[PDB]
Amino acid sequence: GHQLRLGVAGLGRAFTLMLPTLQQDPRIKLVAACDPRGSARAQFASDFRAPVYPDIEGLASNPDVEAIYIASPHQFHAQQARIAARHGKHVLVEKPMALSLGDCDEMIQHCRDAGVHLIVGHCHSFDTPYLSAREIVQSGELGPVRMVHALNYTDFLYRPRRPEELRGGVVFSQAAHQVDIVRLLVGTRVRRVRAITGDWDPMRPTQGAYSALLWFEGGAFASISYNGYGHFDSDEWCDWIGEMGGDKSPIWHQHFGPIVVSCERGDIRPLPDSVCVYADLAKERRSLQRPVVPRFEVIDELYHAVVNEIKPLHDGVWARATLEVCLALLDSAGSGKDVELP
Amino acid sequence: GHQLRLGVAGLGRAFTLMLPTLQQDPRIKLVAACDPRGSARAQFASDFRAPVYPDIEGLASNPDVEAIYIASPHQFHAQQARIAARHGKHVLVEKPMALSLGDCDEMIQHCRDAGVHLIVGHCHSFDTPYLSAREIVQSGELGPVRMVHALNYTDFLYRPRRPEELRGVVFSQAAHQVDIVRLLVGTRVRRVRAITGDWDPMRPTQGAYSALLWFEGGAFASISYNGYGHFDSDEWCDWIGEMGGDKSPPIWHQHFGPIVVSCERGDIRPLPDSVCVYADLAKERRSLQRPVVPRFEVIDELYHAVVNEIKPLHDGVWARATLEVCLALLDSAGSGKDVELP
């Protein structure tokens, strides 16, 4: 009702990254969890004094639950969503939505049939610096976007796996964030993608880096780069604030690396603690407000979806489009060809 | 001999940018100039008490001249080189060498026939931070290069034209960038794919681009450039300018924007005042020595070419290869297709 009664499916990393949000936002009440391993069930039931269950069917059958946060691994998203929706519970799914586009269509459809909302999980595109810059672009103040430059040098490939674990892989975890932000900011449709991947650690044999070109409806283009072999660290170019808002010399907004938005009449630079605008007149650090609850913008989007029926932006149709770009990206780097999108 | 007796053809901007170098390097003696405009002839003859001439044929006919610095506009490079070489004078040509590849072949040939050196002019790839990082790559210390990321946000499109200027980001700006990536990666460019932007109707040229570059051996590079002068990337080079000046109230090395070199075992970041190395063990700011003479590395390359017969790196064969990439770049952005390079 006033307080949103929320179930959590899958008590892993995604969940522990989200947990400070769920604890601190007074709109949220955590009522019920499920997870296959009892060690974790015993752990949630302890801390929250709340019914835990082996599976989704247990969690969705509880009538106190209003919505479920699906934080399990992706091969399980489509199945878990279908179930939640069957039992009429709204769905916030961590990224990526799913593995395949068919999976996504099924998800969007099952959620329509139940008349419940489908919002895709935490995504860096929810972060308010980017939300703020989207507003500048919409306001027309600087004309349309013509070019976007995005890069991010992380150590994602060599982060110790956490106890809660449960099993996100540069293109499916990291590229989704990036693509998502560029889509948010430009605000038109991706028409063509061309990408190169790098894979140069034999010990750790995955695609740990890429560079890509992205073509947009209306003539803007974007260049996106990512490296996760953890040498150079691009936070240095974001006022030394971390992905989760901490200081790296009272925390700040979440962000996902240096991004420069080139519009007709100026450049926009989103920071965790401001938005820099470079224009024909002057150059400005436009102030932002310290977030009182981390990732509150995810909860706003859910809370206004459920309580006030306001269409959420990061919906299933949206999340799906990102997946498409990520698939196209991976396909382009795999063949040696451009990929055109419908 | 001991002191290199140098002629200058074309007393424009290229020349005035080079002038502090030529005055201050004790190896260099300025003996003679030519230029079509008397106002400039009168000006050089005054300051340097030296014979000036209407054209190249005047300058090259003077037997005191050992070598000529060709700083005229490019449509004049090939004809001027042929002339200097006919009269057996070595040739330092400002960038771009020429506008055509046929022009370049003629130039390389005319200089071979005369048995004189052909070095291409000031190019940012001569700058010692980049030279120093090339050495790290050669030393094998970090394995081969796997990825290069290069960007540069300038105001090149809206720089007042200077008095001297004998009055365009691909042949001036992209050459610098391509050149550095070629220096650092150290193999051959095999494929290029590029997008240009052109979004100011007042100033209708290609003022920005992003490109992918494929290399022999599997490294890839991403290069971005924007010259509509809003954001200023010097912010990401310790606030030092292109010509080594400080831009945040004794100068430093020349440079051409943020560059990150990704090798197998670590990242290399050339700065105007150091080279940062990020490796598996630690991360280091490796110190460099202040330049006592700006662009001394250009003079080293010339002086050791003429006096001691040491093969120069930025030779005619080399400069030419860059042009190829620049042509490929422009071609790719013009059609919508990859360009493969012999």
For A262, the closest of B222, B226, B276 (CB atoms) is: B226
As given in the structure block, the two tokens for residue A191 are: 């028409």
Q: Could you give the CA distance from residue B170 to residue B322 in angstroms, rounded to a whole number?
A: 11
B16 and B154 assigned to the same domain: no
Same structural domain for residues A228 and A274? yes
Q: One-letter amino acid identity for A10?
A: G
Give whole-number Cα distances, B231 to A267, A272, A278, B226, in Å. Answer: 6, 17, 6, 9
Q: How far is Cα A217 from Cα A320, in angstroms, rounded to an integer?
A: 18
Do B134 and B113 belong to one domain? no
| Residue A245 Cα, gap to closest chain B Cα (Å) | 21
Tokens of A61: 């059958």
Instruction: Give the dihedral sign, CA B306/B311/B312/B318.
Output: positive
Q: How far apart are CA B133 and CA B129, in angstroms?
A: 6
3-state secondary structure (DSSP) of residue B128: helix
Sign of CA dihedral B253, B254, B260, B264: negative
In a domain, A318, yes or no: no
Same domain flag for A72 and A134: no
Domain presence at residue A114: yes
CATH of the domain at A44: 3.40.50.720
Displacement of CA B146 from its chain's centroid (Å): 24
- Number of C-alpha atoms within 13 angstroms, CB side, residue A275? 20
Residues 6+ apart with CB under 8 A from A309: none
Give the method used.
Answer: X-ray
Residue A109 domain-assigned? yes
| Spatial contact of B127 and B103, defined as CB atoms under 8 Å apart | no
State the alpha helices, DSSP H only, in chain B. Answer: 13-24, 38-48, 56-60, 77-86, 101-113, 128-139, 175-185, 296-306, 316-334
| A85 shares its domain with A111 | yes
Is there a domain that residue B287 lies in? yes
A286-300 residues labelled b (16+ CB within 10 A) or e (exposed): eebeebebbbbbbbb
Nearest CA in chain A to B198: A146
Range of the domain at B115: 4-122+295-315
**Other Cβ atoms closer than 10 A to B86:** 15
Most A CBs within 10 Å, among B142, B177, B238, B262, to test the A interface? B262
Q: What is the CATH number of the domain that holds B252?
A: 3.30.360.10
Give B-chain residues touching A270 at CB under 8 angstroms. none
Co-location of A137 and A11 in the same domain: no
Q: Burial, A187: exposed, middle or buried (Cβ in 10 Å; 0-12, 13-18, 19+)?
A: middle
- Expressed in percent and rounded to 5, the helix, strand and coil fractions of chain B are 35, 25, 40
> Which residue's entry shows tokens 């979806």?
A305
What are the structure tokens assigned to A189, written together? 């449709």
d(CA B127, CA B294): 9
B212 and A211 within 8 Å at the Cβ level: the answer is yes
**Are residues B215 and B92 part of one domain?**
no
Q: Are residues B137 and B284 in the same domain?
A: yes
As given in the structure block, the two tokens for residue B111 are: 């200089």
Residues linked to residue B278 through DSSP beta bridges, in sequence order? B267, B283
A contacts of B193 (beta carbons < 8 Å): 194, 213
Q: How many domains does chain B have?
A: 2
Q: How many CB atoms lie within 10 A of CB A311?
A: 9
**A234 vs A279: CA distance, rounded Å:** 25
A136 and A279 part of one domain: yes
The helix (H) or strand (E) run that includes residue A24 is helix A13-24
- A342 assigned to some structural domain: no
- Within 8 A of B197 by CB-CB distance, chain A residues are 146-147, 221, 262
Domain annotation covers residue A16: yes
d(CA B268, CA B276): 6
CB atoms within 10 A of CB B284: 13
Q: What's the token pair of residue B307?
A: 């006096």
The residue among B286, B243, B254 whose CA lies nearest residue B267 is B286
Nearest to B224 among A149, A237, A278 (CB): A149
Token duo for residue A128? 């308010």
Chain B residues touching A269 at Cβ < 8 A: 231
- Classify burial at A336, counting beta carbons within 10 Å of its beta carbon; exposed 0-12, middle 13-18, buried 19 or more: exposed
In angstroms, what separates the C-alpha of A230 from chain B's closest C-alpha?
Answer: 8
Distance from CA of A278 to the nearest CA of B (A): 5
Same domain? B112 vs B174: no
Burial B16-30 (b: 16+ CB within 10 A, else e): ebbbebbeebebbbb
- B217 Rama class: left (phi>0) / alpha (psi -120 to 50) / beta: left
Q: State the helix-helix crossing angle for A316-334 and A101-113, rounded to 10 degrees.
A: 170
Is the peptide bond between B96 and the residue preceding it cis, with omega within 30 degrees of 0? yes
Peptide bond into A96 cis (omega under 30): yes
A299's enclosing H/E stretch is: helix A296-306
B111: left (phi over 0), alpha (psi -120 to 50) or beta: alpha
B45, B52 contact by CB (below 8 A): yes
Rounded distance, CA B179 to CA B185, Å? 10
Question: Resolution reached, in Å?
Answer: 2.8
The encoded tokens of residue A209 equal 């880096």
CA distance A80 to B299: 69
Domain assignment present for residue B257? The answer is: yes
CB A84 within 8 A of CB A60: yes
Q: Are residues A251 and A269 in the same domain?
A: yes
Cα four-point dihedral sign A147, A153, A158, A163: negative
Which whole-number Å values give the CA distances from A58 to A76, A319, B7, in the listed order? Answer: 15, 27, 88
Residues 219-238 of A with CB under 8 A from B: 221-223, 225, 227, 229, 231-233, 237
In the beta sheet, which residues pair with residue A278? A267, A283
Beta strand B274-279 with B283-287: parallel, antiparallel or unpaired? antiparallel
- The set of residues, in sequence order, having a beta carbon less than 8 Å from that of A122 and lying 6+ positions away, is A14, A17, A18, A94, A95, A295, A298
Q: What is the DSSP string of A197-232?
A: EE---SSS-S--EEEEEEEETTS-EEEEEEE-SSSS
Going across the sheet that includes B90-93, the strands are B52-53, B28-34, B4-9, B67-70, B90-93, B118-120
The answer to whether residues A130 and A275 touch, using CB atoms and an 8 Å cutoff, is no
Q: Are residues B186 and B290 in the same domain?
A: yes
Strands A28-34 and A4-9: parallel
Contact A14, A73 (CB under 8 A): no
A149 with B226: Cβ contact below 8 A: yes
Q: Does the residue A340 lie in any domain? A: no
CB-CB under 8 Å, B220 with A196: yes
